[PDB]
């Protein structure tokens, strides 16, 4: 057990760490923001995303 | 002279440092642990160390 106290230097103070672990998979997309969906074209070249 | 004091942050606190310096030489081995010596074979292929 560590035993950190609030009156010492930063070398013995607790820091909450969120280890973001992820992987780019074959699965359908889940979490990629509120970004605007656009229209669809079937004959013209576009910069699709 | 630094003049260190025990009531300041870690940026101004003395740290004892042991600089390990070594080199892999032709000389016979000296310091490589209590690891178990094994038997010897003269006709069979092995993974020697």
């Amino acid at each position: 057990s560590y035993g950190f106290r609030p009156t010492y230097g930063v070398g013995h103070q607790p820091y909450r760490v969120v280890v973001l672990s992820f992987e780019l998979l074959h699965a359908p997309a889940t979490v990629c923001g509120p970004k605007k969906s656009t229209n669809l074209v079937k004959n013209k070249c576009v910069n699709f995303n």
Side-chain angles (χ1 to χ4, degrees), chain A residues 16-41:
Chain A
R16 281 185 285 160
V17 164
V18 190
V19 178
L20 273 298
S21 173
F22 38 77
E23 61 85 20
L24 275 300
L25 206 62
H26 64 279
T30 52
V31 300
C32 64
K35 277 69 45 144
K36 205 65 283 165
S37 160
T38 74
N39 304 321
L40 191 61
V41 69

